[model samples]
Target: AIIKEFMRFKVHMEGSVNGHEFEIEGEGEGRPYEGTQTAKLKVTKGGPLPFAWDILSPQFSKAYVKHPADIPDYLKLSFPEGFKWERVMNFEDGGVVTVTQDSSLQDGEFIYKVKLRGTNFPSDGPVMQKKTMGWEASSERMYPEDGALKGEIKQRLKLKDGGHYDAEVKTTYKAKKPVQLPGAYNVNIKLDITSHNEDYTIVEQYERAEGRHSTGGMD
Candidate 1:
């Protein structure tokens, strides 16, 4: 079972494709900050607090199977501080843009790679199922209310007639300003995706929790 804490947000996008205007609605999730070493779990004065109160705990369902101690893939898969599983984008066709940690440098900054792929790919469908894309991005050391990052995405598309084409888009995120610490931090995302076939880019923006969530930044 995969377990981690995150605040979800609504995705708003508007842009043009192939010169045509388009819009899409999707949702996103933000994970723990890079500086956080401990889980959100706390030992209450009473026995364990009820599950309902732990909004972001790593609790598992009764039907979840236990894994061996030797394999701790769930933590790597769910937690972004180590695994780097940041949500990039959600497409109209149910595809997704995913970002993963590439490497940590001596300077303590993290470089990440982004992937665009089909979600729940089916056995029989359009040739689009075989198409995929990727790119690299780097983050700056972030401080509260000033964190920011920038990257460019270049995608090569496969055509129905057995040909290919390319497209490019810019991406960025803003949160706290740069400090020095790094582990896993939360931020607001700004991304716009476009390819040759679709022809237009959809610019996106999301708000932090902004007092709407139990947590301060994002819920």
Candidate 2:
């Protein structure tokens, strides 16, 4: 018999662009900022876990220029305030999980979502079963002033009996420095992120069975 069970998880990300670094870190119970942005979920009890990161460092600024015609019309415009990246994950009963990413730039944001179905338990008995998935996207023309933009996400899941499981996800985004066009100098940007979740369960059967053998078992 299973008495109590609950899931605990954490998310963390750290990256830099042209020497300016930033980080976003958080856990299931939530925590204060530790010199980095907090990725804590909006609610700790139920519903999906939501978190985000905003960047507005000078590294994201446009190149310096003496004349307006030196660069293209897009480059002439002031750079947007900053970049916004967000994520949400929902874990349902029976091992089904949903992951979503809504990241944005000056022009607009990109949306990516996927559902992961639980796999069958291992035939060898109460061991562990695992699965992994990944996705990536890139564009050379999307943000001409910022150069080529690319992003990728990787996820892993470990499932076990008694409602126990573990999950880990990582993401990465990069903006390659544009080729020296005419007289413009561009800054390169790169960012990486990681999040993890571990579930715990208590079974009355295991506790009662262990209690009976406590006197006879010792190391």
Candidate 3:
């Protein structure tokens, strides 16, 4: 079972594609930052009793640090911070895009992985044993609000097919702890164009989450 904590994120960028702009929505979860809020309660029986709460013990989610998704793949999938993505885009007939991703950290270094594939894919029909009419239905859209693509999605296929689309994907979060990178780069995204049309827009959009997720200068 994969278990971890997540928080909210904001989107940045003008979100674009094929020299066109199409409005879209996005959302994601932040790495669960959890620690013990420890304190020492004193049993006082008299005057101005001083109250103080100091972190005595630190605890983390046994499931989070131990989850297959959070640990083990430390080097291959690094998260000096966390993982993120943008929504998918469903276009004309016989077209579907799918991208998988992960992050890792090891030996004072970080790395991320992304793999995307599309098919007449729309072509893959999940047959429903229908009794009469109303056949089967797949709710794929021109743009996905959530999924592997959750941050910013500016890629579009219709750009070639004469369908314009675009949007910005942004993320903002708190590190809780001070961590530094060799470079000041806050986000590292790898875009893998699967199919390119009008040049090639049919490929795949791949990205990696790196650096401090913030809007201010890193010190």
**Candidate 2: segments with Cα more than 4 A from true spot:** 1-37, 44-80, 84-148, 161-219
lDDT score at residue 183, model 1, on the 0-100 scale? 31
Clashes of each: 23, 0, 36
Q: Report every candidate's CA lDDT.
A: 0.26, 0.22, 0.24
lDDT of 1 by residue, 95-134 (tens): 3333322211112222222222223323332222334322
Q: Lowest lDDT 10-mer window, candidate 2?
A: 202-211
Per-residue CA lDDT of model 2 for 1-219, tens digit only, reads: 010122122433333322223343333211111111112322222112111111111011111122223333222122222122222222222222222222222222211111222233233322222222111111111122234222222322223333322322222222222233322222222222233343211100000000011122235
TM-score leader: 1
Sort all candidates by lDDT, best to worst: 1, 3, 2
The count of residue-pair clashes in candidate 3 stands at 36
Which candidate would rank higher by TM-score, 2 or 3?
3
TM-score of 2: 0.21
